[PDB]
PDB file of C-alpha atoms and ligand atoms in Angstrom:
ATOM      1  CA  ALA V   1       0.000   0.000   0.000  1.00  0.00           C
ATOM      2  CA  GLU V   2       0.988   3.532  -0.599  1.00  0.00           C
ATOM      3  CA  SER V   3      -0.050   6.811   0.983  1.00  0.00           C
ATOM      4  CA  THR V   4      -0.674   8.958  -2.090  1.00  0.00           C
ATOM      5  CA  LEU V   5      -2.838   8.462  -5.175  1.00  0.00           C
ATOM      6  CA  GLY V   6      -0.117   8.388  -7.797  1.00  0.00           C
ATOM      7  CA  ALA V   7       2.110   6.030  -5.841  1.00  0.00           C
ATOM      8  CA  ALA V   8      -0.826   3.744  -5.121  1.00  0.00           C
ATOM      9  CA  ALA V   9      -1.715   3.618  -8.807  1.00  0.00           C
ATOM     10  CA  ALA V  10       1.904   2.951  -9.709  1.00  0.00           C
ATOM     11  CA  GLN V  11       1.878  -0.321  -7.765  1.00  0.00           C
ATOM     12  CA  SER V  12      -0.110  -1.731 -10.712  1.00  0.00           C
ATOM     13  CA  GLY V  13       1.752   0.258 -13.379  1.00  0.00           C
ATOM     14  CA  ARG V  14      -0.948   2.926 -13.567  1.00  0.00           C
ATOM     15  CA  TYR V  15      -0.988   6.656 -12.977  1.00  0.00           C
ATOM     16  CA  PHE V  16      -3.251   8.995 -11.035  1.00  0.00           C
ATOM     17  CA  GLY V  17      -3.329  12.444 -12.557  1.00  0.00           C
ATOM     18  CA  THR V  18      -4.895  15.861 -12.395  1.00  0.00           C
ATOM     19  CA  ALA V  19      -5.541  18.891 -14.532  1.00  0.00           C
ATOM     20  CA  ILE V  20      -3.136  21.732 -13.709  1.00  0.00           C
ATOM     21  CA  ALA V  21      -3.901  25.405 -14.380  1.00  0.00           C
ATOM     22  CA  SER V  22      -1.016  27.833 -14.778  1.00  0.00           C
ATOM     23  CA  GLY V  23      -2.917  30.597 -12.993  1.00  0.00           C
ATOM     24  CA  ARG V  24      -2.954  28.450  -9.815  1.00  0.00           C
ATOM     25  CA  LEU V  25       0.796  27.715  -9.780  1.00  0.00           C
ATOM     26  CA  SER V  26       1.436  30.533  -7.315  1.00  0.00           C
ATOM     27  CA  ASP V  27      -0.914  28.909  -4.744  1.00  0.00           C
ATOM     28  CA  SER V  28       1.236  27.008  -2.277  1.00  0.00           C
ATOM     29  CA  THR V  29      -1.569  24.732  -1.104  1.00  0.00           C
ATOM     30  CA  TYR V  30      -2.380  23.814  -4.691  1.00  0.00           C
ATOM     31  CA  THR V  31       1.172  23.159  -5.775  1.00  0.00           C
ATOM     32  CA  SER V  32       2.086  21.131  -2.697  1.00  0.00           C
ATOM     33  CA  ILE V  33      -1.009  18.911  -2.685  1.00  0.00           C
ATOM     34  CA  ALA V  34      -0.881  18.415  -6.441  1.00  0.00           C
ATOM     35  CA  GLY V  35       2.833  17.726  -6.227  1.00  0.00           C
ATOM     36  CA  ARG V  36       2.373  15.137  -3.512  1.00  0.00           C
ATOM     37  CA  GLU V  37      -0.630  13.282  -4.905  1.00  0.00           C
ATOM     38  CA  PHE V  38      -0.393  13.005  -8.713  1.00  0.00           C
ATOM     39  CA  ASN V  39       2.091  11.451 -11.135  1.00  0.00           C
ATOM     40  CA  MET V  40       0.406  12.638 -14.345  1.00  0.00           C
ATOM     41  CA  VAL V  41      -0.577  16.147 -15.457  1.00  0.00           C
ATOM     42  CA  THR V  42      -2.904  17.482 -18.125  1.00  0.00           C
ATOM     43  CA  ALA V  43      -2.853  21.240 -18.812  1.00  0.00           C
ATOM     44  CA  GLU V  44      -6.378  22.457 -18.099  1.00  0.00           C
ATOM     45  CA  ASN V  45      -6.287  25.070 -20.905  1.00  0.00           C
ATOM     46  CA  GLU V  46      -2.725  25.929 -21.881  1.00  0.00           C
ATOM     47  CA  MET V  47      -2.211  23.290 -24.571  1.00  0.00           C
ATOM     48  CA  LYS V  48      -5.499  24.019 -26.363  1.00  0.00           C
ATOM     49  CA  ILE V  49      -5.618  25.566 -29.823  1.00  0.00           C
ATOM     50  CA  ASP V  50      -6.271  29.140 -28.812  1.00  0.00           C
ATOM     51  CA  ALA V  51      -3.590  29.154 -26.142  1.00  0.00           C
ATOM     52  CA  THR V  52      -0.868  27.607 -28.295  1.00  0.00           C
ATOM     53  CA  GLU V  53      -1.533  29.233 -31.677  1.00  0.00           C
ATOM     54  CA  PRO V  54      -3.197  32.592 -30.955  1.00  0.00           C
ATOM     55  CA  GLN V  55      -2.583  33.773 -34.574  1.00  0.00           C
ATOM     56  CA  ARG V  56      -2.172  31.463 -37.508  1.00  0.00           C
ATOM     57  CA  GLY V  57       1.459  30.417 -37.749  1.00  0.00           C
ATOM     58  CA  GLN V  58       2.391  32.238 -34.528  1.00  0.00           C
ATOM     59  CA  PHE V  59       2.819  29.828 -31.636  1.00  0.00           C
ATOM     60  CA  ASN V  60       2.940  30.809 -27.991  1.00  0.00           C
ATOM     61  CA  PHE V  61       4.022  28.019 -25.683  1.00  0.00           C
ATOM     62  CA  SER V  62       4.666  30.212 -22.647  1.00  0.00           C
ATOM     63  CA  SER V  63       1.748  28.990 -20.518  1.00  0.00           C
ATOM     64  CA  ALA V  64       1.912  25.478 -21.881  1.00  0.00           C
ATOM     65  CA  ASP V  65       5.594  25.235 -21.013  1.00  0.00           C
ATOM     66  CA  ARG V  66       4.926  26.568 -17.534  1.00  0.00           C
ATOM     67  CA  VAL V  67       2.573  23.641 -16.941  1.00  0.00           C
ATOM     68  CA  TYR V  68       4.818  21.130 -18.710  1.00  0.00           C
ATOM     69  CA  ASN V  69       7.903  22.242 -16.815  1.00  0.00           C
ATOM     70  CA  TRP V  70       6.051  22.202 -13.485  1.00  0.00           C
ATOM     71  CA  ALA V  71       4.992  18.656 -14.214  1.00  0.00           C
ATOM     72  CA  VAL V  72       8.397  17.325 -15.129  1.00  0.00           C
ATOM     73  CA  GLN V  73      10.130  19.219 -12.281  1.00  0.00           C
ATOM     74  CA  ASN V  74       7.677  17.525  -9.934  1.00  0.00           C
ATOM     75  CA  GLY V  75       8.131  14.051 -11.354  1.00  0.00           C
ATOM     76  CA  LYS V  76       4.980  13.759 -13.459  1.00  0.00           C
ATOM     77  CA  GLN V  77       4.368  12.707 -17.007  1.00  0.00           C
ATOM     78  CA  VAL V  78       2.100  14.790 -19.221  1.00  0.00           C
ATOM     79  CA  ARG V  79      -0.992  14.144 -21.295  1.00  0.00           C
ATOM     80  CA  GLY V  80      -1.221  16.666 -24.118  1.00  0.00           C
ATOM     81  CA  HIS V  81      -4.699  18.196 -24.444  1.00  0.00           C
ATOM     82  CA  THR V  82      -5.965  18.822 -27.180  1.00  0.00           C
ATOM     83  CA  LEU V  83      -5.002  19.260 -30.842  1.00  0.00           C
ATOM     84  CA  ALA V  84      -8.232  19.345 -32.884  1.00  0.00           C
ATOM     85  CA  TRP V  85     -11.548  20.375 -31.339  1.00  0.00           C
ATOM     86  CA  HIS V  86     -14.576  22.526 -32.102  1.00  0.00           C
ATOM     87  CA  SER V  87     -14.226  24.383 -28.780  1.00  0.00           C
ATOM     88  CA  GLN V  88     -11.760  27.006 -27.642  1.00  0.00           C
ATOM     89  CA  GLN V  89     -10.688  27.699 -31.208  1.00  0.00           C
ATOM     90  CA  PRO V  90      -9.025  31.054 -31.772  1.00  0.00           C
ATOM     91  CA  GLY V  91     -11.031  33.443 -33.939  1.00  0.00           C
ATOM     92  CA  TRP V  92      -8.712  32.998 -36.912  1.00  0.00           C
ATOM     93  CA  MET V  93      -9.479  29.273 -37.040  1.00  0.00           C
ATOM     94  CA  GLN V  94     -13.221  29.783 -36.521  1.00  0.00           C
ATOM     95  CA  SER V  95     -13.124  31.782 -39.787  1.00  0.00           C
ATOM     96  CA  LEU V  96     -11.670  28.850 -41.788  1.00  0.00           C
ATOM     97  CA  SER V  97     -13.566  26.129 -43.583  1.00  0.00           C
ATOM     98  CA  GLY V  98     -12.936  23.331 -46.000  1.00  0.00           C
ATOM     99  CA  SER V  99      -9.450  22.904 -47.388  1.00  0.00           C
ATOM    100  CA  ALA V 100      -8.046  26.001 -45.711  1.00  0.00           C
ATOM    101  CA  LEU V 101      -9.240  24.750 -42.333  1.00  0.00           C
ATOM    102  CA  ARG V 102      -7.831  21.314 -43.108  1.00  0.00           C
ATOM    103  CA  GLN V 103      -4.378  22.795 -43.777  1.00  0.00           C
ATOM    104  CA  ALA V 104      -4.578  24.900 -40.604  1.00  0.00           C
ATOM    105  CA  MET V 105      -5.665  21.861 -38.557  1.00  0.00           C
ATOM    106  CA  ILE V 106      -2.716  19.866 -39.891  1.00  0.00           C
ATOM    107  CA  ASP V 107      -0.277  22.718 -39.357  1.00  0.00           C
ATOM    108  CA  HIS V 108      -1.503  23.182 -35.785  1.00  0.00           C
ATOM    109  CA  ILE V 109      -1.028  19.475 -34.985  1.00  0.00           C
ATOM    110  CA  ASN V 110       2.438  19.484 -36.513  1.00  0.00           C
ATOM    111  CA  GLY V 111       3.604  22.629 -34.742  1.00  0.00           C
ATOM    112  CA  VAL V 112       2.398  21.721 -31.259  1.00  0.00           C
ATOM    113  CA  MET V 113       3.544  18.102 -31.429  1.00  0.00           C
ATOM    114  CA  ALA V 114       6.971  19.171 -32.747  1.00  0.00           C
ATOM    115  CA  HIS V 115       7.421  21.455 -29.762  1.00  0.00           C
ATOM    116  CA  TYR V 116       6.854  18.507 -27.405  1.00  0.00           C
ATOM    117  CA  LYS V 117       8.195  15.681 -29.562  1.00  0.00           C
ATOM    118  CA  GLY V 118       9.120  12.676 -27.457  1.00  0.00           C
ATOM    119  CA  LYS V 119       7.990  14.403 -24.265  1.00  0.00           C
ATOM    120  CA  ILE V 120       4.244  13.573 -24.121  1.00  0.00           C
ATOM    121  CA  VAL V 121       3.037  10.111 -23.255  1.00  0.00           C
ATOM    122  CA  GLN V 122      -0.506  10.588 -24.608  1.00  0.00           C
ATOM    123  CA  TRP V 123      -2.107  13.213 -26.846  1.00  0.00           C
ATOM    124  CA  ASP V 124      -5.830  13.902 -27.021  1.00  0.00           C
ATOM    125  CA  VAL V 125      -5.520  14.352 -30.776  1.00  0.00           C
ATOM    126  CA  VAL V 126      -9.252  14.842 -31.313  1.00  0.00           C
ATOM    127  CA  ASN V 127     -11.825  15.880 -28.726  1.00  0.00           C
ATOM    128  CA  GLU V 128     -15.620  15.748 -28.658  1.00  0.00           C
ATOM    129  CA  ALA V 129     -16.438  14.833 -32.239  1.00  0.00           C
ATOM    130  CA  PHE V 130     -19.832  13.176 -31.493  1.00  0.00           C
ATOM    131  CA  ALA V 131     -23.191  14.760 -30.899  1.00  0.00           C
ATOM    132  CA  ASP V 132     -25.196  14.071 -27.763  1.00  0.00           C
ATOM    133  CA  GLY V 133     -28.532  12.304 -27.893  1.00  0.00           C
ATOM    134  CA  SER V 134     -29.795   9.272 -29.754  1.00  0.00           C
ATOM    135  CA  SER V 135     -28.453   9.838 -33.258  1.00  0.00           C
ATOM    136  CA  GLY V 136     -24.811   8.966 -32.939  1.00  0.00           C
ATOM    137  CA  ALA V 137     -24.116  11.714 -35.440  1.00  0.00           C
ATOM    138  CA  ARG V 138     -20.974  13.768 -35.595  1.00  0.00           C
ATOM    139  CA  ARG V 139     -21.157  17.117 -33.857  1.00  0.00           C
ATOM    140  CA  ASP V 140     -21.561  20.060 -36.185  1.00  0.00           C
ATOM    141  CA  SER V 141     -18.431  22.198 -36.417  1.00  0.00           C
ATOM    142  CA  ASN V 142     -16.190  23.742 -39.043  1.00  0.00           C
ATOM    143  CA  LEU V 143     -13.971  20.689 -38.624  1.00  0.00           C
ATOM    144  CA  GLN V 144     -16.782  18.207 -39.265  1.00  0.00           C
ATOM    145  CA  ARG V 145     -18.062  20.279 -42.184  1.00  0.00           C
ATOM    146  CA  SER V 146     -14.618  19.903 -43.789  1.00  0.00           C
ATOM    147  CA  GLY V 147     -15.355  16.184 -44.212  1.00  0.00           C
ATOM    148  CA  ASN V 148     -15.980  12.999 -42.284  1.00  0.00           C
ATOM    149  CA  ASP V 149     -12.255  12.235 -42.670  1.00  0.00           C
ATOM    150  CA  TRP V 150     -11.149  15.152 -40.485  1.00  0.00           C
ATOM    151  CA  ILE V 151     -10.643  12.881 -37.507  1.00  0.00           C
ATOM    152  CA  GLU V 152      -8.617  10.255 -39.376  1.00  0.00           C
ATOM    153  CA  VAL V 153      -6.511  12.985 -41.000  1.00  0.00           C
ATOM    154  CA  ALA V 154      -5.754  14.431 -37.583  1.00  0.00           C
ATOM    155  CA  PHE V 155      -4.616  11.007 -36.337  1.00  0.00           C
ATOM    156  CA  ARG V 156      -2.492  10.274 -39.392  1.00  0.00           C
ATOM    157  CA  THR V 157      -0.884  13.691 -39.016  1.00  0.00           C
ATOM    158  CA  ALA V 158      -0.184  13.086 -35.344  1.00  0.00           C
ATOM    159  CA  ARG V 159       1.357   9.644 -35.932  1.00  0.00           C
ATOM    160  CA  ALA V 160       3.837  11.143 -38.397  1.00  0.00           C
ATOM    161  CA  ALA V 161       4.606  14.120 -36.186  1.00  0.00           C
ATOM    162  CA  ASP V 162       5.493  12.098 -33.087  1.00  0.00           C
ATOM    163  CA  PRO V 163       5.589   8.344 -33.506  1.00  0.00           C
ATOM    164  CA  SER V 164       6.432   7.971 -29.775  1.00  0.00           C
ATOM    165  CA  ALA V 165       3.153   9.388 -28.494  1.00  0.00           C
ATOM    166  CA  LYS V 166       0.049   7.372 -27.781  1.00  0.00           C
ATOM    167  CA  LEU V 167      -2.711   8.956 -29.850  1.00  0.00           C
ATOM    168  CA  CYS V 168      -6.048   9.256 -28.068  1.00  0.00           C
ATOM    169  CA  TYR V 169      -9.602  10.138 -29.069  1.00  0.00           C
ATOM    170  CA  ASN V 170     -11.324  11.846 -26.088  1.00  0.00           C
ATOM    171  CA  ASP V 171     -15.037  12.442 -25.439  1.00  0.00           C
ATOM    172  CA  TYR V 172     -17.769  12.635 -22.801  1.00  0.00           C
ATOM    173  CA  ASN V 173     -21.096  10.871 -22.445  1.00  0.00           C
ATOM    174  CA  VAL V 174     -19.372   7.794 -23.927  1.00  0.00           C
ATOM    175  CA  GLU V 175     -19.055   5.810 -20.682  1.00  0.00           C
ATOM    176  CA  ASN V 176     -22.446   4.075 -20.593  1.00  0.00           C
ATOM    177  CA  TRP V 177     -22.324   1.049 -22.875  1.00  0.00           C
ATOM    178  CA  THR V 178     -26.032   1.417 -23.775  1.00  0.00           C
ATOM    179  CA  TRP V 179     -25.862   5.028 -24.988  1.00  0.00           C
ATOM    180  CA  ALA V 180     -25.931   5.849 -28.659  1.00  0.00           C
ATOM    181  CA  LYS V 181     -22.953   8.175 -28.357  1.00  0.00           C
ATOM    182  CA  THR V 182     -20.840   5.394 -26.826  1.00  0.00           C
ATOM    183  CA  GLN V 183     -21.819   3.131 -29.696  1.00  0.00           C
ATOM    184  CA  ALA V 184     -20.944   5.796 -32.259  1.00  0.00           C
ATOM    185  CA  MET V 185     -17.479   6.140 -30.765  1.00  0.00           C
ATOM    186  CA  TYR V 186     -17.120   2.340 -30.648  1.00  0.00           C
ATOM    187  CA  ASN V 187     -18.005   2.011 -34.296  1.00  0.00           C
ATOM    188  CA  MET V 188     -15.494   4.755 -35.203  1.00  0.00           C
ATOM    189  CA  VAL V 189     -12.622   3.170 -33.348  1.00  0.00           C
ATOM    190  CA  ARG V 190     -13.443  -0.204 -34.834  1.00  0.00           C
ATOM    191  CA  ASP V 191     -13.584   1.327 -38.346  1.00  0.00           C
ATOM    192  CA  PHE V 192     -10.282   3.115 -37.784  1.00  0.00           C
ATOM    193  CA  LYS V 193      -8.557  -0.070 -36.693  1.00  0.00           C
ATOM    194  CA  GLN V 194      -9.973  -1.913 -39.724  1.00  0.00           C
ATOM    195  CA  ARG V 195      -8.689   0.736 -42.144  1.00  0.00           C
ATOM    196  CA  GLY V 196      -5.259   1.304 -40.639  1.00  0.00           C
ATOM    197  CA  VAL V 197      -5.986   4.700 -39.116  1.00  0.00           C
ATOM    198  CA  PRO V 198      -3.441   5.099 -36.300  1.00  0.00           C
ATOM    199  CA  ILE V 199      -5.276   5.323 -32.977  1.00  0.00           C
ATOM    200  CA  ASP V 200      -3.832   3.968 -29.764  1.00  0.00           C
ATOM    201  CA  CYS V 201      -6.161   5.060 -26.976  1.00  0.00           C
ATOM    202  CA  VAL V 202      -9.622   6.227 -26.060  1.00  0.00           C
ATOM    203  CA  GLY V 203     -10.162   8.859 -23.361  1.00  0.00           C
ATOM    204  CA  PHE V 204     -13.343   8.729 -21.335  1.00  0.00           C
ATOM    205  CA  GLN V 205     -13.755  12.169 -19.851  1.00  0.00           C
ATOM    206  CA  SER V 206     -15.939  10.724 -17.085  1.00  0.00           C
ATOM    207  CA  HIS V 207     -17.798  13.877 -16.089  1.00  0.00           C
ATOM    208  CA  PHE V 208     -20.486  12.018 -14.138  1.00  0.00           C
ATOM    209  CA  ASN V 209     -23.557  13.826 -12.840  1.00  0.00           C
ATOM    210  CA  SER V 210     -27.275  13.378 -12.387  1.00  0.00           C
ATOM    211  CA  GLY V 211     -28.021  13.803 -16.093  1.00  0.00           C
ATOM    212  CA  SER V 212     -25.131  11.575 -17.177  1.00  0.00           C
ATOM    213  CA  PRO V 213     -24.708   9.193 -14.292  1.00  0.00           C
ATOM    214  CA  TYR V 214     -22.107   6.548 -13.705  1.00  0.00           C
ATOM    215  CA  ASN V 215     -23.262   3.004 -14.525  1.00  0.00           C
ATOM    216  CA  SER V 216     -21.581  -0.266 -13.591  1.00  0.00           C
ATOM    217  CA  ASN V 217     -21.523  -0.997 -17.305  1.00  0.00           C
ATOM    218  CA  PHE V 218     -18.605   1.441 -17.588  1.00  0.00           C
ATOM    219  CA  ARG V 219     -16.463  -1.609 -16.999  1.00  0.00           C
ATOM    220  CA  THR V 220     -18.081  -3.267 -20.011  1.00  0.00           C
ATOM    221  CA  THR V 221     -17.385  -0.152 -22.090  1.00  0.00           C
ATOM    222  CA  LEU V 222     -13.747  -0.198 -21.050  1.00  0.00           C
ATOM    223  CA  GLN V 223     -13.414  -3.928 -21.764  1.00  0.00           C
ATOM    224  CA  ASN V 224     -15.021  -3.638 -25.164  1.00  0.00           C
ATOM    225  CA  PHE V 225     -12.814  -0.763 -26.310  1.00  0.00           C
ATOM    226  CA  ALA V 226      -9.746  -2.605 -24.942  1.00  0.00           C
ATOM    227  CA  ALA V 227     -10.768  -5.562 -27.133  1.00  0.00           C
ATOM    228  CA  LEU V 228     -10.454  -3.314 -30.224  1.00  0.00           C
ATOM    229  CA  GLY V 229      -6.735  -2.995 -29.547  1.00  0.00           C
ATOM    230  CA  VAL V 230      -6.647   0.404 -27.896  1.00  0.00           C
ATOM    231  CA  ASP V 231      -5.667   1.456 -24.445  1.00  0.00           C
ATOM    232  CA  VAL V 232      -8.298   3.239 -22.359  1.00  0.00           C
ATOM    233  CA  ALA V 233      -7.909   6.135 -19.990  1.00  0.00           C
ATOM    234  CA  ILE V 234     -10.208   7.971 -17.605  1.00  0.00           C
ATOM    235  CA  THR V 235      -9.187  11.538 -18.542  1.00  0.00           C
ATOM    236  CA  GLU V 236     -11.290  14.155 -16.749  1.00  0.00           C
ATOM    237  CA  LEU V 237     -13.010  12.445 -13.874  1.00  0.00           C
ATOM    238  CA  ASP V 238     -15.268  14.431 -11.615  1.00  0.00           C
ATOM    239  CA  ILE V 239     -18.521  13.335  -9.992  1.00  0.00           C
ATOM    240  CA  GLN V 240     -21.331  15.631  -8.859  1.00  0.00           C
ATOM    241  CA  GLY V 241     -21.366  15.608  -5.045  1.00  0.00           C
ATOM    242  CA  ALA V 242     -18.186  13.453  -4.922  1.00  0.00           C
ATOM    243  CA  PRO V 243     -19.931  10.363  -3.600  1.00  0.00           C
ATOM    244  CA  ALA V 244     -17.284   8.022  -2.211  1.00  0.00           C
ATOM    245  CA  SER V 245     -18.996   4.890  -3.452  1.00  0.00           C
ATOM    246  CA  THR V 246     -19.127   6.091  -7.078  1.00  0.00           C
ATOM    247  CA  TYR V 247     -15.495   7.194  -6.947  1.00  0.00           C
ATOM    248  CA  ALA V 248     -14.481   3.737  -5.691  1.00  0.00           C
ATOM    249  CA  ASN V 249     -16.573   2.128  -8.392  1.00  0.00           C
ATOM    250  CA  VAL V 250     -14.871   4.047 -11.191  1.00  0.00           C
ATOM    251  CA  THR V 251     -11.457   3.325  -9.720  1.00  0.00           C
ATOM    252  CA  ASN V 252     -12.183  -0.379  -9.496  1.00  0.00           C
ATOM    253  CA  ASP V 253     -13.420  -0.431 -13.112  1.00  0.00           C
ATOM    254  CA  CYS V 254     -10.024   0.891 -14.239  1.00  0.00           C
ATOM    255  CA  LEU V 255      -8.185  -1.585 -12.021  1.00  0.00           C
ATOM    256  CA  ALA V 256     -10.201  -4.431 -13.514  1.00  0.00           C
ATOM    257  CA  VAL V 257      -9.177  -3.643 -17.096  1.00  0.00           C
ATOM    258  CA  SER V 258      -5.607  -4.393 -18.048  1.00  0.00           C
ATOM    259  CA  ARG V 259      -5.534  -1.769 -20.810  1.00  0.00           C
ATOM    260  CA  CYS V 260      -6.754   0.998 -18.501  1.00  0.00           C
ATOM    261  CA  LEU V 261      -3.708   3.258 -18.237  1.00  0.00           C
ATOM    262  CA  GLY V 262      -4.849   5.314 -15.284  1.00  0.00           C
ATOM    263  CA  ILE V 263      -7.175   7.989 -14.050  1.00  0.00           C
ATOM    264  CA  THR V 264      -6.973  11.790 -14.209  1.00  0.00           C
ATOM    265  CA  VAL V 265      -9.363  13.859 -12.084  1.00  0.00           C
ATOM    266  CA  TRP V 266     -10.273  17.217 -13.528  1.00  0.00           C
ATOM    267  CA  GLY V 267      -8.702  19.374 -10.839  1.00  0.00           C
ATOM    268  CA  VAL V 268      -7.328  19.337  -7.336  1.00  0.00           C
ATOM    269  CA  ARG V 269      -9.672  21.037  -4.790  1.00  0.00           C
ATOM    270  CA  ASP V 270     -13.385  21.481  -5.300  1.00  0.00           C
ATOM    271  CA  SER V 271     -12.662  25.220  -5.528  1.00  0.00           C
ATOM    272  CA  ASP V 272     -10.344  24.549  -8.528  1.00  0.00           C
ATOM    273  CA  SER V 273     -13.080  22.785 -10.471  1.00  0.00           C
ATOM    274  CA  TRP V 274     -14.707  24.085 -13.601  1.00  0.00           C
ATOM    275  CA  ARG V 275     -17.888  22.874 -11.840  1.00  0.00           C
ATOM    276  CA  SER V 276     -16.984  23.917  -8.298  1.00  0.00           C
ATOM    277  CA  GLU V 277     -20.676  24.344  -7.382  1.00  0.00           C
ATOM    278  CA  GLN V 278     -21.045  20.564  -7.805  1.00  0.00           C
ATOM    279  CA  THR V 279     -18.190  19.923  -5.285  1.00  0.00           C
ATOM    280  CA  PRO V 280     -17.049  17.097  -7.524  1.00  0.00           C
ATOM    281  CA  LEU V 281     -13.386  16.463  -6.646  1.00  0.00           C
ATOM    282  CA  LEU V 282     -11.298  14.654  -4.012  1.00  0.00           C
ATOM    283  CA  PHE V 283     -10.048  17.561  -1.873  1.00  0.00           C
ATOM    284  CA  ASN V 284     -11.993  20.177   0.012  1.00  0.00           C
ATOM    285  CA  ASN V 285     -11.558  23.900  -0.552  1.00  0.00           C
ATOM    286  CA  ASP V 286      -9.111  23.984   2.349  1.00  0.00           C
ATOM    287  CA  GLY V 287      -7.007  21.194   0.914  1.00  0.00           C
ATOM    288  CA  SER V 288      -8.224  18.503   3.299  1.00  0.00           C
ATOM    289  CA  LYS V 289      -9.107  15.028   1.996  1.00  0.00           C
ATOM    290  CA  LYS V 290     -12.747  14.170   1.349  1.00  0.00           C
ATOM    291  CA  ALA V 291     -14.377  10.842   1.907  1.00  0.00           C
ATOM    292  CA  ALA V 292     -14.030  10.171  -1.817  1.00  0.00           C
ATOM    293  CA  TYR V 293     -10.220  10.546  -1.524  1.00  0.00           C
ATOM    294  CA  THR V 294     -10.049   7.710   0.982  1.00  0.00           C
ATOM    295  CA  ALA V 295     -12.342   5.535  -1.117  1.00  0.00           C
ATOM    296  CA  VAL V 296     -10.113   6.000  -4.187  1.00  0.00           C
ATOM    297  CA  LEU V 297      -6.875   5.454  -2.303  1.00  0.00           C
ATOM    298  CA  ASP V 298      -8.267   2.313  -0.653  1.00  0.00           C
ATOM    299  CA  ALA V 299      -9.356   0.983  -4.043  1.00  0.00           C
ATOM    300  CA  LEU V 300      -5.931   1.654  -5.556  1.00  0.00           C
ATOM    301  CA  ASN V 301      -4.373  -0.167  -2.576  1.00  0.00           C
ATOM    302  CA  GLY V 302      -6.740  -3.175  -2.952  1.00  0.00           C
TER     303      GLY V 302
HETATM  304  O1  LIG Z   1     -11.239  25.917 -17.357  1.00  0.00           O
HETATM  305  C1  LIG Z   1     -12.193  25.221 -18.154  1.00  0.00           C
HETATM  306  C2  LIG Z   1     -11.721  23.788 -18.386  1.00  0.00           C
HETATM  307  O2  LIG Z   1     -11.786  23.063 -17.177  1.00  0.00           O
HETATM  308  C3  LIG Z   1     -12.574  23.132 -19.421  1.00  0.00           C
HETATM  309  O3  LIG Z   1     -12.014  21.858 -19.680  1.00  0.00           O
HETATM  310  C4  LIG Z   1     -12.797  21.087 -20.601  1.00  0.00           C
HETATM  311  C5  LIG Z   1     -13.970  20.407 -19.889  1.00  0.00           C
HETATM  312  N1  LIG Z   1     -14.828  19.833 -20.952  1.00  0.00           N
HETATM  313  C6  LIG Z   1     -14.096  18.782 -21.711  1.00  0.00           C
HETATM  314  C7  LIG Z   1     -12.758  19.276 -22.264  1.00  0.00           C
HETATM  315  O4  LIG Z   1     -12.061  18.192 -22.838  1.00  0.00           O
HETATM  316  C8  LIG Z   1     -11.903  20.032 -21.224  1.00  0.00           C
HETATM  317  O5  LIG Z   1     -10.840  20.682 -21.869  1.00  0.00           O
HETATM  318  O6  LIG Z   1     -12.583  23.857 -20.604  1.00  0.00           O
HETATM  319  C9  LIG Z   1     -13.224  25.117 -20.430  1.00  0.00           C
HETATM  320  C10 LIG Z   1     -12.395  25.963 -19.466  1.00  0.00           C
HETATM  321  O7  LIG Z   1     -13.074  27.185 -19.236  1.00  0.00           O
END
């Protein structure tokens, strides 16, 4: 047994990560608890398209590198998040469509991945490409309107840019095996594997709440994606109300699936959360451990 989340995960070769925000890196409580507890970091915003390429062709890695360097100085690996996405696009990219957008998408992938080549264990190459609801359709965006192949092109680009990185597709509302969105993502990954599209991993954001609740069948989802020949990762876990039982359940689903790489929670203290009103994380506002912390640690320790 181990006394911290990352170390406990590492006993089985897994990680326990968090999202890190550069604007919080002057908060001594934040940096010390995050430093102690996690062995994997995702930048909460700093590696997104707008942050890294604020004008076309003009990269700015200052905030991204602050997060990256904090991670490596503190003994963590890094998940890169995210290269191609409808959200948080800079204005210049929102104005592009079709072939011009395709070139810009490719250029963005190449430039960001080159900056971090060999340094990033997993990239969320593509984020949130499916619609919610019963259709299983692709989400509408400039990217999708450029062609159904946008996603595969992004992956092929990423494979060439950094052959050392695990290339992940990341999404939410894809945890429940019975949901249409989950099935759409399953069919995509299966199709990609069958056609030689390079994809190594699927990220389950795992933003569980009353409208999109955890189900025990998450384990079935994880198993079934693993059986396609991809790793699986829980990438942005948070749970409305931070119920200890649900947190243990998710943890045990990862531990039960050999291809589950690890778990990232989407922030440190409840007050750091993008959904702080839902108190959905493992640490209280004052940095103390919640009941859910103990349930996760105990699960990681068997
Ligand atoms: O600061 C928030 C940030 O937490 C949020 O992160 C996204 C949550 N939804 C899924 C995405 O994959 C995450 O990047 O993005 C919006 C920011 O304002």
